[PDB]
Amino acid sequence: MYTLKKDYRLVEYLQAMRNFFLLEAGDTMYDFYTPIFDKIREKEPWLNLSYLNVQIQEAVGQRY
Amino acid sequence: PREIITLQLGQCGNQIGFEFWKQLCAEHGISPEGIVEEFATEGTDRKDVFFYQADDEHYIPRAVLLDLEPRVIHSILNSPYANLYNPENIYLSEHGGGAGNNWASGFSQGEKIHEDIFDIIDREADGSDSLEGFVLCHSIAGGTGSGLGSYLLERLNDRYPKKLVQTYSVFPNQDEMSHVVVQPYNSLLTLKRLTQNADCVVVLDNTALNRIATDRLHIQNPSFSQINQLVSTIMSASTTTLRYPGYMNNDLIGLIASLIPTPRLHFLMTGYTPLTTDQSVASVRKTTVLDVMRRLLQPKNVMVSTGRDRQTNHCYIAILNIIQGEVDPTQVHKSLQRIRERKLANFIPWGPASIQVALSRKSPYLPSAHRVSGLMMANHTNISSLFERTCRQYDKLRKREAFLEQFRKEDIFKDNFDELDNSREIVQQLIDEYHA
Amino acid sequence: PREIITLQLGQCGNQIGFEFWKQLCAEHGISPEGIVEEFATEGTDRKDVFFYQADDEHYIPRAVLLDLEPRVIHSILNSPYANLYNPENIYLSEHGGGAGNNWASGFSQGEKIHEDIFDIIDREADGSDSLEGFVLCHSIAGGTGSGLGSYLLERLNDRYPKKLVQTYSVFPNQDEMSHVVVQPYNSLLTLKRLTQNADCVVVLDNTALNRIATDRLHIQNPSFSQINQLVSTIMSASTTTLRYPGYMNNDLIGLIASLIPTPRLHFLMTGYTPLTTDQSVASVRKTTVLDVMRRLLQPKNVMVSTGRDRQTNHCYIAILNIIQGEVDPTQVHKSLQRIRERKLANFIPWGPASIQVALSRKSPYLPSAHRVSGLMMANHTNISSLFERTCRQYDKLRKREAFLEQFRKEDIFKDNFDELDNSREIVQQLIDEYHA
């Protein structure tokens, strides 16, 4: 547990994937969502993979 | 960004917005010209969702302070807060106006500084890339803040109508009438604009305010300079979903939308319990979460005047109860269970009401690290009680023949007197038709 | 050994190149005598590239100044850098002039001073190791630059065919008709040589010059002295792949080969971010490099007037974004990730386009090694508006009966006016056909 806490930061990694897809994060996944959700509301293709891969790039840069 | 641009307007509306910013500097622990601690990112996880983003390692609020009397903004340069604000991108130093006590001055002053009043909000919005709205922190107290603020409810509802419009109105003390005489006129003039040029508002009152200031603050004589302390904190309390982590309703337009069922019923009463500094000695034995929402559903913290025999012939419809700081988020479902057996919240006699409960983690500060905090954002159908108090002093005033031709000199020359009177009667009736 | 001779011609053409040579001495850190800065050789790895190749440590502008107006050139020889200039291979000290201010004045004076105008570029090409070309820093304003400038647009196309042609075509405010009125006639004779006897132009309009002069340098009443800093900066700015080594398109005919789709479309719009003193506050810690081309993704700094609504009926084909100095370049490949996602610059639909990114080293002089810079060399097909704009000012001038016999007393005595009309419409069709 000494190398698994400092050498590799295990538990920080645990809350990190929880911020991704357990929705434990702030307006990170929120501001990812509403651009996609405004395209759903007018039923225009939101998949469109490419911009979504830039929307999670923009997600993780929110809150800093 | 969920940047909201605050429209501080008025002699009193400036001051209540002024200590709103100083509060944010006291808890983020910052210097007003430098970020001198690591509490800016450890304490708070967004610090520029209401502020202009770092480009010098500093944060510049998203506020504009325009006012007819430059004297309230000149009292900001005698404090170390005129380098937290800027000299033209927040406020123009020495921007004059009227006398000003007339409403019809400030209404015509938005129509000739018309070019600059929509350049100052867009000078201070060069990093909003997805706008929340505009919250008009404009006071009804004084003719300065009610006149120019009534203009801006209209031009921001024709360019940004689906975006938030929401005002913190404070109707001046209605137990004076020889301190202010233009008081039924400036109130009913903004009240026309809240219901068809605006979505939702959050009302307040001064005469229900000072009730609490001697019961929980314990001042010797009510005077405006303690009134601003109690208001400035509930303004930073309502944005603790948007400045710290969350998910369900983590927007300010997420919280406020769910307190509206029908237009003309969206007037939110505000209540805030930890004003007493004898609850910091009763936390060594634990203040519990079970009873902190049994004093939020109690009418004691009510900043809007109303009867205690008008809550037996009316019921609350939507009530939001926000805990900050300690909460214990496993016994909060234990807190709501006992609510129904006492029945301190009334439920509408035509379906179930709504008790929305929320929690939020905060930056280290005294009612969010040692003692429980409750913000209430009520929605009660007894709100016609202020409107009857203002409309019975408005037609009485016309029976003394005041401001029916001592008001028709500057831009009123038609009959618009019955226009405020009747549109107030549509509001007094439509609430009662939709509430048994 | 890539020596360019600037050919300043016309009244406005002499004022814009005056501060161009003045920018070079200030950034190379040199004295008009010798070296006083060792950043002169460490920063500029090719000092001689517009200057005389030293053989006693002296640098001489390779400039020629011919003009029929002695008022503009007498302010060049009463300068501290009038010793950087020598009146013995450049110009006379107190030089003369023609009428001038007529296109037929300067075109006929072009051919009886034919010996000295082609023996003053070969008295500045005798240490030369091969000439790059000639840059015609000529005006579109008045008949002076335009008469004498139409001559050298011809002879450098056939006594010098190999050599590069590229002009700084600067318009005056086209709404003058009482200090100059012969401006649509003198313009079109020069505009015809510019598209058939020239390969490239660098267009510049004046109404977008004063667009910057009131919102980036901020005057309350216009002056034409805030117009010569804007041109003189963009002049030294294009040569940061050539005054300091590149790697690829390190030649100036390299940049231009990828910026020209084919002649019939070659008019490059110019854009320049650091003209304002609020871009030195975005380099005290370095602001991110993601945003310095997403302000050139849709311009808001162009020295060419155009609508922002004429970006959706037109499609960019080649756009160059040259970044300069310290920008901390390692998130620059991240910046091209985000370009396709907004599409504020439409790309042509018959085939692929080009998003060109560049970086360049420059001397450690403060505005070339601190401030974040975006230099735009666009080539957008919404330029057909400017050609429709000069042609609308011609056809209106012929129905007032002006210059039907008033301009054909001198060196015009044959029809050539509808030749100017037709050649403008073939150019206009072929710009729009390249996005069709």
Question: Chain B residues with CB inside 8 Å of C287's CB?
Answer: 55
What is the Cα A48 distance to its own chain's centre? 17
Tell whether A30 lies on the interface with B, counting CB pairs under 8 A.
yes
Give the length of chain A: 64
3-class DSSP assignment, residue C21: helix
Count other Cβ atoms within 10 Å, centred on residue B149.
Answer: 27
**Long-range contacts of A53-61, Cβ-Cβ distance < 8 Å, separation of 24 or more:** A54/C337, A54/C338, A54/C341, A56/A32, A57/C337, A58/A31, A58/A32, A59/A28, A59/A29, A59/A31, A59/A32, A60/A28
Count other Cβ atoms within 10 Å, centred on residue C245.
Answer: 11
Contacts of A among chains (3+ CB pairs under 8 A): B, C
Distance between CA atoms of residues C393 and C388, nearest Å: 9
Tell whether A51 lies on the interface with C, counting CB pairs under 8 A.
yes
Query: B-contacting residues of A 8-27, CB under 8 Å?
Result: 23-27
CA angle B39, B41, B42 (to 5 degrees): 60
3-class DSSP assignment, residue C121: coil
| Contact (CB, 8 A) for B249 and B358 | yes
Query: What b/e readout covers B88-119, taking b as 16+ CB neighbours within 10 angstroms?
Result: eebbbeebebbebbbbbbbbbbbeebeeebee
Count other Cβ atoms within 10 Å, centred on residue C223.
Answer: 11
Contacts of B among chains (3+ CB pairs under 8 A): A, C
ω into residue B374 within 30 of 0, thus cis?
no
Chain A nearest C-alpha distance from B412 (Å): 44
The technique by which this structure was obtained is: cryo-EM
Chain C nearest C-alpha distance from B66 (Å): 22
| Contact (CB, 8 A) for B140 and B171 | yes
- Nearest-10 Cα torsion for B14, B19, B24, B29: 140
B247 to A23: CB separation less than 8 angstroms, yes or no: yes
Lookup: tokens for B278: 């004898």
Strand B373-377's sheet: what is its strand order?
B270-272, B373-377, B319-324, B355-360
Tell whether B127 lies on the interface with A, counting CB pairs under 8 A.
no
DSSP C427: H
Distance between CA atoms of residues C56 and C58, nearest Å: 6
Count other Cβ atoms within 10 Å, centred on residue B229.
Answer: 15
Distance between CA atoms of residues C165 and C188, nearest Å: 18
In DSSP terms, which residues pair with B60 in a beta bridge?
Answer: B52
| Contact (CB, 8 A) for C123 and C206 | no
| Contact (CB, 8 A) for B262 and B434 | yes
Distance between CA atoms of residues B418 and B422, nearest Å: 6
* Helix axis angle, B15-27 to B227-238, nearest 10°: 60
Interface test with chain A among B38, B250, B362, B363, by most A beta carbons within 10 Å: B250
Tell whether B57 lies on the interface with C, counting CB pairs under 8 A.
yes
Tell whether B415 lies on the interface with C, counting CB pairs under 8 A.
no
Tell whether A58 lies on the interface with B, counting CB pairs under 8 A.
no
What is the gyration radius of the CA atoms in chain C, in angstroms? 21
Give the length of chain B: 436
Tell whether A64 lies on the interface with B, counting CB pairs under 8 A.
yes
Chain B nearest C-alpha distance from A24 (Å): 7
Tell whether B287 lies on the interface with A, counting CB pairs under 8 A.
no
Count other Cβ atoms within 10 Å, centred on residue A18.
Answer: 12
Count other Cβ atoms within 10 Å, centred on residue C218.
Answer: 11
Question: Chain A residues with CB inside 8 Å of C338's CB?
Answer: 54
Question: Chain B residues with CB inside 8 Å of A64's CB?
Answer: 41, 45
CA angle B62, B68, B71 (to 5 degrees): 85
Going by C-alpha positions, the residue among C397, C132, C428 that lies closest to residue C254 is: C132
The one-letter amino acid code at B147 reads G
What is the Cα B262 distance to its own chain's centre? 20
A51 to C341: CB separation less than 8 angstroms, yes or no: yes
Tell whether C333 lies on the interface with A, counting CB pairs under 8 A.
no
With CA atoms as reference, the chain C residue closest to A48 would be C341
Q: The tokens 């920080």 sit on which residue?
A: A12
Question: Chain C residues with CB inside 8 Å of B56's CB?
Answer: 281, 284-285
- Give the annotated binding-site residues of B for GTP: 141-147
The one-letter amino acid code at B378 reads A
3-class DSSP assignment, residue C27: helix
C334: left (phi over 0), alpha (psi -120 to 50) or beta: alpha
Give how far Cα B116 sits from Cα of B23, B89, B122, C188, Å: 29, 11, 10, 42
Give how far Cα B61 sits from Cα of B17, B95, B364, C324, Å: 11, 20, 21, 32
Q: The tokens 């927040």 sit on which residue?
A: B90
Tell whether A50 lies on the interface with C, counting CB pairs under 8 A.
yes
With CA atoms as reference, the chain A residue closest to B254 would be A30
Query: A-contacting residues of B 38-57, CB under 8 Å?
Result: 41, 45-46, 49
Handedness of CA C113, C115, C116, C121 (dihedral sign): positive
With CA atoms as reference, the chain C residue closest to B57 would be C285
With CA atoms as reference, the chain A residue closest to C335 would be A54
Going by C-alpha positions, the residue among C367, C383, C72 that lies closest to residue C202 is: C383
Phi, psi for residue C366 in degrees, rounded to 5: -50, -60
Q: B201-205 and B267-268 as β-strands: parallel, antiparallel, unpaired?
A: parallel
Instruction: Tell me the residue ranges of DSSP E strands in C365-433.
Output: 375-379
Question: Chain A residues with CB inside 8 Å of C340's CB?
Answer: 50
Give how far Cα C11 sits from Cα of C156, C174, C225, C280, Å: 21, 16, 14, 33
Strand B168-171's sheet: what is its strand order?
B168-171, B201-205, B267-268
Distance between CA atoms of residues B111 and B130, nearest Å: 28
Lookup: tokens for B195: 């219901």
C282 to B57: CB separation less than 8 angstroms, yes or no: no
- Give the annotated binding-site residues of C for GTP: 141-147
Instruction: Using CB atoms, pick whichever of A25, A34, A64 lies closest to residue B245.
Output: A25
In DSSP terms, which residues pair with C3 in a beta bridge?
Answer: C131
Resolution in A: 4.6
Stated as kind and residue range, the H or E segment containing C318 is strand C318-322
A25 to B247: CB separation less than 8 angstroms, yes or no: yes
The one-letter amino acid code at B160 reads Y
B49 to A25: CB separation less than 8 angstroms, yes or no: no
Count other Cβ atoms within 10 Å, centred on residue C327.
Answer: 20
| Contact (CB, 8 A) for B209 and B227 | yes
Distance between CA atoms of residues A23 and A16, nearest Å: 10
* SS3 track for chain B: CCCEEEEEECCCCCHHHHHHHHHHHHHCCCEECECCCHHHCCCCCCCCCCEECCCCCCCEECEEECCCCCCCCCCCCCCCCCCCCCCCCCCCCCCCCCCCCCHHHHCCCCCCCCCCCCCCCCCCCCCCCCCCEEEECECCCCCHHHHCCCCHHHHCCCCCCCCECCEEEEECCCCCCCCCCCHHHHHHHHHCCCCCCCCCEEEEECCCCHHHHCCCCCCCCCCCCCHHHHHHHHHHHHCCCCCCCCCCCCCHHHHHHHHCCCCCCCEECEEECCCCCCCCCCCCCCCCCCCCCCCCCCCCCCCCCCCCCCCCCCCECCEEEEEECCCCCCCHHHHCCCHHHHCCCCCCECECCCEEEEEECCCCCHHHCCCCEEEEECCECCCHHHHHHHHHHHHHHHCCCCCCCCCCCCCCCCCCHHHHHHHHHHHHHHHHHCCC
Question: Chain C residues with CB inside 8 Å of B55's CB?
Answer: 281-282, 285, 287
